[PDB]
Design an enzyme around this catalytic site. Sequence first.
Site, PDB file in Angstrom:
ATOM      1  N   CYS A 196     -83.290  10.643  43.071  1.00 30.41           N
ATOM      2  CA  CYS A 196     -82.084  11.146  43.742  1.00 30.41           C
ATOM      3  C   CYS A 196     -81.888  10.492  45.128  1.00 30.41           C
ATOM      4  O   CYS A 196     -80.814  10.613  45.741  1.00 30.41           O
ATOM      5  CB  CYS A 196     -82.043  12.694  43.796  1.00 30.41           C
ATOM      6  SG  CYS A 196     -83.433  13.555  44.626  1.00 30.41           S
TER       7      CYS A 196
ATOM      8  N   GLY B  89     -82.667   7.075  45.607  1.00 34.10           N
ATOM      9  CA  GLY B  89     -82.442   5.655  45.403  1.00 34.10           C
ATOM     10  C   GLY B  89     -83.171   5.086  44.210  1.00 34.10           C
ATOM     11  O   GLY B  89     -83.359   5.770  43.205  1.00 34.10           O
TER      12      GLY B  89
ATOM     13  N   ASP C   9    -101.561  13.479  47.027  1.00 37.17           N
ATOM     14  CA  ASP C   9    -101.253  13.443  45.577  1.00 37.17           C
ATOM     15  C   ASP C   9    -102.006  12.360  44.781  1.00 37.17           C
ATOM     16  O   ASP C   9    -101.462  11.709  43.913  1.00 37.17           O
ATOM     17  CB  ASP C   9     -99.736  13.389  45.289  1.00 37.17           C
ATOM     18  CG  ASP C   9     -99.401  13.896  43.858  1.00 37.17           C
ATOM     19  OD1 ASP C   9    -100.317  14.423  43.137  1.00 37.17           O
ATOM     20  OD2 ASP C   9     -98.224  13.752  43.441  1.00 37.17           O
TER      21      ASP C   9
END
Length: 264
Positions: free
Chosen positions: A22, A24, A131
């Site tokens: 959302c 790019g 992450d």
Amino acid sequence: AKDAWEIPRESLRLEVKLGQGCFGEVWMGTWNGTTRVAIKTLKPGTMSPEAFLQEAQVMKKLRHEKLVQLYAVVSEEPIYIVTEYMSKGSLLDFLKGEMGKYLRLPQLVDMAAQIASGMAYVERMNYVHRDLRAANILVGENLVCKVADFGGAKFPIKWTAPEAALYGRFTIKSDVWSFGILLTELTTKGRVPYPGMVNREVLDQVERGYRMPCPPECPESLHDLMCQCWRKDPEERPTFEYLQAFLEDYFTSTEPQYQPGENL
Ligand SMILES: COc1ccc(Nc2ncnc(-c3cccnc3Nc3cc(NC(=O)c4ccc(CN5CCN(C)CC5)cc4)ccc3C)n2)cc1
């Protein structure tokens, strides 16, 4: 007047679209016609320009052969972030795909060693990844692996240390927990961890002390490493420096008797 990181817009050529967000897009392409690059786009008016170049600022002070390397920036809208290109895609895809099936323990422990190496740098520099998992590892020729980050709200709760998921306490030690989960991913050909379980059972169970068992054909000594990464107390967890050296030496110091099997 701006950065030595800046490049002219004509030096970039975007050849192949590697995916969409959302915010790019990401493309493989070329830089100076000669160098293969990965190129990240910011859709203007969909997120702060300042909020986009945050990453780029961070990647400026980061330089290691096992972290994805920033090559350049086009720092005025439409903004562009440019890095080295990794020809083989995600470790996750690589593990489950047609390459997956020939990987045995010696290639897989070597890959773990590289990732531990990139992460020991992150540790040395007092950063946190937040992450770490196989979906954020990139594979290049020659089984080179590097630590990437592709970007509460959502949660990879299965890869995330309890003190982090519950109370937001993310440290290098919560990355060490994740590294343990990544070791299961590497030993099961990329299978989602805690099979059959959902987020809430994982949280309930791990809190009561459940830990994944030794994967089939995985030496106990490697499963023990995973278990050290999964110690309830974040400070009992080992360092990536320790992890890196344990894995480098694995087939001499820890499993000198290792014999290839069907999957590992
Ligand atoms: C078939 O399918 C494919 C897919 C990909 C490729 N090959 C490829 N090779 C290269 N890069 C991309 C790539 C793919 C998709 C998205 N991004 C990619 N690279 C990339 C990566 C980054 N940034 C990072 O990796 C990164 C890594 C570490 C940090 C450190 N922080 C972490 C956060 N903490 C809270 C603070 C510290 C920060 C950023 C920035 C920009 C780009 C363009 N792909 C080939 C084929």
